[PDB]
Design a protein around this ligand. Structure first.
Ligand SMILES: Nc1ncnc2c1ncn2[C@@H]1O[C@H](CSCC[C@H](N)C(=O)O)[C@@H](O)[C@H]1O
Ligand SMILES: O=c1[nH]c(=O)c2ncnnc2[nH]1
Length: 225
């Protein structure tokens, strides 16, 4: 494992020190994202390679439905889903100014919540859920509770689409200069994680990130029977 650029601006290096506890990490996590969005360093928002994941989830739904956008950012994917006729709930640690014009365009068809995914209450409220680059920044000790919440929020025939950094070789854990964590996955590793969280993968796609010289791994799953 060696340091490498993960996006236009940020180099990430393998973690070697002991990880901050999940409680302290949640603060490191929010701090980097609010600074990145404030500064306009959310280079993922306009990355072309980020667009296929939402179309992939819709393809697995096949009809207008009720969709959770987990870690929705500025709302690009939320807008995409709303244009397909979905009712969308968009959730993020950081509320960007773009949520207001989205609310003005789509009215009651969109709901925004500025909270952690883990805070979302309810069960069996969604037909689909999109995680477009959120899970792979969580504390590893929080993967299970994060995925369990998504699992509980989906209806029995729900579909979950998740996009992660694809690893070259066995995936490892990295951190950026702000100490935000980055996990890269191989397809077997991501499939193993979803299966352990009681999801059954039904699709996976290697989405090129041409300007970054990398790939996203975009996997779609149903609940395990
Ligand atoms: N535990 C958590 N709960 C909710 N949102 C989270 C989170 N951890 C990270 N995030 C949010 O997840 C996003 C990852 S960046 C990807 C943003 C968006 N999905 C897009 O496609 O452009 C950031 O907006 C970050 O604020
Ligand atoms: O720092 C980040 N850079 C990225 O390119 C990215 N892409 C998807 N999700 N999170 C990201 N975080």
């Amino acid at each position: 494992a060696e340091p490498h650029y993960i996006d236009a601006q940020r180099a990430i290096a393998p973690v070697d020190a002991p990880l901050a506890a999940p409680h302290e990490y949640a603060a490191v996590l929010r701090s980097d994202f609010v600074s990145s969005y404030h500064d306009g360093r959310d280079v993922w928002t306009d990355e072309a390679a980020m667009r296929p994941a939402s179309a992939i989830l819709h393809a697995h739904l096949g009809r207008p439905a009720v969709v959770l956008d987990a870690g929705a950012g500025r709302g690009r994917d939320t807008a995409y889903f709303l244009e397909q006729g979905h009712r969308v709930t968009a959730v993020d640690l950081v509320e960007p100014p773009e949520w207001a014009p989205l609310a003005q365009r789509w009215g009651e068809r969109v709901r925004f919540v500025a909270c952690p995914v883990s805070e979302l209450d309810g069960e069996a409220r969604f037909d689909g859920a999109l995680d477009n680059g959120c899970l792979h920044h969580q504390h590893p000790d929080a993967y299970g509770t994060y995925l369990a919440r998504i699992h509980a929020l989906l209806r029995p025939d729900g579909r979950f689409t998740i996009s992660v950094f694809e690893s070259d070789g066995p995936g490892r854990l990295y951190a950026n200069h702000a100490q935000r964590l980055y996990r890269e996955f191989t397809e077997p590793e991501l499939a193993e994680l979803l299966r352990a969280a009681h999801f059954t993968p039904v699709d996976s796609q290697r989405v090129p990130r041409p300007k970054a010289g990398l790939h996203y791994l975009v996997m779609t799953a149903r609940k395990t029977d």
